[PDB]
Chain A
């Protein structure tokens, strides 16, 4: 385990890698909003399908 950990290690500050979580969140939020608005359009269409009958 330690062998692979040292093999795949990069010379750089650790506090910068964890920071990437912010970027990843900012890039996931977009897709999450797109899923919100798609499940919303879906819901709306559904309620219309239950309005017409």
Chain B
């Protein structure tokens, strides 16, 4: 069964590999959003 768990670990890896991309996406969004927050406050002031 030692040859079986390899797929499992590589699977967890493959899964997380995109979760990181999600993190990047959300980060980029957060940047893009707060950049707007600045403007909103910049108008509000």
Contacts and interface: CB of A to CB of B under 8 A. Distances in A.
Contacts of A12: 37-38, 41-42
Interface stretch (A14-22, A29-37, A43-51): A14-22
A7 interface: no
B40 interface: yes
A25 interface: no
B5 interface: no
B44 A17 contact: yes
Contacts of A4: none
Of B38, B40, B41, B44, the most chain A CB neighbours within 10 A belong to B41
B32 interface: no
